[PDB]
Design a protein around this ligand. Structure first.
Ligand SMILES: *[C@@H]1O[C@H](CO[C@H]2O[C@@H](C)[C@@H](O)[C@@H](O)[C@@H]2O)[C@@H](O[C@@H]2O[C@H](CO)[C@@H](O[C@@H]3O[C@H](CO[C@H]4O[C@H](CO)[C@@H](O)[C@H](O)[C@@H]4O[C@@H]4O[C@H](CO)[C@@H](O)[C@H](O)[C@H]4NC(C)=O)[C@@H](O)[C@H](O[C@H]4O[C@H](CO)[C@@H](O)[C@H](O)[C@@H]4O[C@@H]4O[C@H](CO)[C@@H](O)[C@H](O)[C@H]4NC(C)=O)[C@@H]3O)[C@H](O)[C@H]2NC(C)=O)[C@H](O)[C@H]1NC(C)=O
Ligand SMILES: *[C@@H]1O[C@H](CO[C@H]2O[C@@H](C)[C@@H](O)[C@@H](O)[C@@H]2O)[C@@H](O[C@@H]2O[C@H](CO)[C@@H](O[C@@H]3O[C@H](CO[C@H]4O[C@H](CO)[C@@H](O)[C@H](O)[C@@H]4O[C@@H]4O[C@H](CO)[C@@H](O)[C@H](O)[C@H]4NC(C)=O)[C@@H](O)[C@H](O[C@H]4O[C@H](CO)[C@@H](O)[C@H](O)[C@@H]4O[C@@H]4O[C@H](CO)[C@@H](O)[C@H](O)[C@H]4NC(C)=O)[C@@H]3O)[C@H](O)[C@H]2NC(C)=O)[C@H](O)[C@H]1NC(C)=O
Lengths: 259, 218, 216
């Protein structure tokens, strides 16, 4: 199960820049074997690191590798461009939550000011001095075509790149069998609808007002022996990734208890 | 050349009032200090409005407009006294923002040079034109300075709907001249309608003059 | 004004009208290249004419600017009638400091050429009180805006006339005025002056009109 990684993470590069491609599997003493495929075609190179001393137009295309394993690596599309400016991306296709690095790279590393970054046509960030853009956590809203503009001698533009953000599961719903306000003493079961697994274990949490219901090592529910008038309010549960990498807090669901 | 060069920051453009604003007392002339490249991070803008060096207040502010490119645009309008402007009083705009190392002193003031009163001469159509369905009425304006000006054509107490006026042109004497061409149906002329060319300029008595036209044997 | 770090810029210029207008003249298209570094002075020209590469382009000598850029000029000789038929001329610029070549296209404004109507107008009576008087030549109904106007007298050109820029008329056409200025003395003895005009849409690309006023 190989996987391709790029030294310059950048999937789109200028002519004459250096880029080395490594196929790496986490084995300490792993044999030096590699099977590179291009446009469905194996290259003669077997070393796990694809070094490009001087890139070319012909160096462009989709890259895949196989090293000492059953199956083959994911296909990675590499594009070499010509022009003045280049919006550089760490990835073309990713699921939300994975971080995304962007770079508006200038020719010959020339200095550019009043740099603009675009998402789906809308400028969302301006930089007086050229800077990297890192989204610590991505979502489907980050999906779309990116552009960049900056001021050198004149307002130059970069080419657009399509970025694909895959959503894992849409936000869950906590549903109650009854409408609020409610009567005192009732035992209530609250269910957080999801009903779908992306293709693991879930930690759930319940809160009350600006304060907090117990946080310790929570499971999915609680039983209210006696629902009381003081219990009228907004109830919610929480969904997050194993990593905590992707986490969703939930919207307030009001429950009013009368008694 | 108020172009003291520095490095990469928000930019300011300072715009003079509209001439008609300068010309009709029943109108309100404005000076305009325009600020671009304001970040969302630093959207706070300070205006100082030194007039000849005397800081004034009572500058206003139209609402900021988010630009498509996601910068902010801010406009400041300083109301101006008619006589203040024509005497060439200086209007200085100072712009403060935390992201600027040093303050900006955009400067403006009325164009310099000897104001010169226009001569106005009205000219009837060439006889050769009298053969057409439409005829050309000519208003010649020359000798004026500065080139800043407003011109209108009128008939029967109403502006005519079909005249054209040239941009100012630099004359050989350092002054400017221009032409405004009014077009009218032949019938109306030969029916002896009276047409008027109206001109507004600093250097005319009451900033205004008109010339009339009808046959004149002698 | 020389901003942060980019490179040379390109401008593509039409011929002078009289060259297009006078057979004793040679009309030229001019491809001008500025902001050339001393470091990267090599310029490549391609000249697709209507798409047809030509070689009969004439490359002018580089001239040093104070800012150490060189105005580079390419002059393509043109047959008068080629331009007027509205053929497209393309200048392509290749250079190592340029990631990609630069393309410029030009050609005559499109639309039905229309003949200017011309009427000459004497000074206003009101001016006759002054030391100087104004002489006007009106040109209207003409298209495209490319044009040349001169003033002459007794077989000689006048040394003192001014002409306005083209103006958009309401009918989509242009008009202008040209002002020739002459001493009153010259005027009242009744010398005859002519405004001369050269245009595609004139017979011989030419017409002139005269103006004379004196006790008939
Ligand atoms: C983000 O978006 C903002 C909006 O831009 C919009 O532009 C187009 C693309 C539009 O389709 C939209 O999609 C865009 O969103 C950008 O703001 C623009 O940014 C530039 C500079 O950054 C501004 O350029 C300045 O504009 C003045 C005014 O010229 C008129 O042109 C338009 C017609 O209205 C209008 O856009 C202008 O506002 C302006 O008209 C005036 O508008 C105001 C509105 O309040 C009215 O009140 C006025 O009545 C109206 N006046 C009219 C009409 O006459 C322009 O004149 C300036 O030119 C200078 O700037 C150049 C520098 O690049 C320079 O080369 C020029 O020479 C000139 O600067 C000086 O010129 C003199 C002449 O000799 C020289 O002596 C000097 O040496 C020279 N240099 C100096 C003094 O430093 C000026 O370019 C543009 O106006 C502005 N948009 C609007 C609207 O104003 C924004 O730029 C963009 N991002 C970034 C990073 O820029
Ligand atoms: C290094 O120095 C150069 C400056 O030269 C030196 O001059 C003096 C000041 C000296 O002391 C030094 O200090 C200076 O170094 C810089 O070169 C300049 O760069 C700018 C742009 O980069 C050029 O701007 C262009 O110029 C045309 C005007 O062209 C006519 O006028 C000039 C007279 O020579 C010259 O440019 C041309 O020759 C041409 O003149 C004709 O040409 C022949 C050739 O000899 C002559 O024999 C003829 O007699 C002569 N006839 C007439 C008439 O001129 C200017 O019009 C262009 O500006 C338009 O295009 C701009 C592109 O961005 C655009 O921004 C503007 O809108 C502008 O307006 C255009 O006008 C039409 C009219 O309708 C509109 O329709 C268009 O839409 C519009 N164009 C556009 C794109 O919108 C053009 O920019 C400038 O010419 C050049 N200076 C020259 C040449 O002398 C050099 O840049 C500098 N280095 C750096 C890094 O800056």
């Amino acid at each position: 199960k190989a996987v391709i990684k790029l030294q310059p993470p950048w999937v789109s590069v200028f002519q004459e820049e250096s880029v080395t491609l490594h196929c790496e599997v986490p084995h300490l003493p792993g044999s030096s074997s590699t099977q590179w495929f291009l446009n469905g075609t194996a290259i003669q190179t077997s070393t796990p690191t694809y070094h490009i001393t001087s890139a070319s137009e012909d160096d462009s295309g989709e890259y895949r590798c196989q090293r000492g394993l059953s199956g083959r690596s994911d296909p990675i599309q590499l594009e070499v461009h010509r022009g003045w400016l280049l919006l550089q991306v760490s990835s073309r296709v990713l699921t939300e939550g994975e971080p995304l690095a962007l770079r508006c790279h200038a020719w010959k590393d020339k200095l550019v000011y009043n740099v603009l970054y675009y998402r789906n046509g809308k400028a969302f960030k301006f930089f007086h001095w050229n800077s990297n853009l890192t989204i610590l956590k991505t979502n489907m809203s980050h999906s779309g075509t990116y552009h960049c503009s900056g001021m050198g001698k004149h307002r130059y533009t970069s080419a657009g790149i399509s970025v694909t953000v895959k959503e894992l599961f849409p936000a869950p719903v906590l549903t109650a069998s009854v409408t609020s306000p409610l009567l005192e003493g009732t035992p209530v079961t609250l269910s957080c609808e999801t009903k779908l697994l992306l293709q693991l274990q879930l930690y759930f949490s319940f809160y009350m007002g600006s304060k907090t219901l117990r946080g310790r090592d929570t499971s999915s529910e609680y039983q209210i022996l006696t629902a009381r008038r003081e219990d009228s309010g907004l109830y919610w549960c929480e969904a997050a990734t194993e990593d905590g990498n992707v986490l969703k807090r939930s919207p307030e669901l009001e429950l009013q208890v009368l008694g | 050349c108020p172009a003291p060069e520095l490095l990469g920051g928000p930019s300011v453009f300072l715009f003079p009032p509209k001439p008609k604003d300068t010309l009709m007392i029943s109108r309100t002339p404005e000076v305009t200090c325009v600020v671009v490249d304001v970040s969302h991070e630093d959207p706070e803008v300070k205006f100082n409005w030194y007039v000849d060096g005397v800081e004034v207040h009572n500058a206003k502010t139209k609402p900021r407009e988010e630009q498509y490119n996601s910068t902010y645009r801010v406009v400041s309008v300083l109301t101006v006294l008619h006589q203040d402007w024509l005497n060439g009083k200086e209007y200085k705009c100072k712009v403060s923002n935390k992201a600027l190392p040093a303050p900006i002193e955009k400067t403006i003031s009325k164009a310099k040079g000897q104001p010169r009163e226009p001569q106005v001469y009205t000219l009837p159509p060439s006889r050769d034109e009298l053969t057409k369905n439409q005829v050309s009425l000519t208003c010649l304006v020359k000798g004026f300075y500065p080139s800043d000006i407003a011109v209108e054509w009128e008939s029967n107490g109403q502006p005519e709907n079909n005249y054209k006026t040239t941009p100012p042109v630099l004359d050989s004497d350092g002054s400017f001249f221009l032409y405004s061409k009014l077009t009218v149906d032949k019938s109306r002329w030969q029916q002896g309608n009276v047409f008027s060319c109206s001109v507004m300029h600093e250097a005319l008595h009451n900033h205004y003059t008109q010339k009339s036209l009808s046959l004149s044997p002698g």
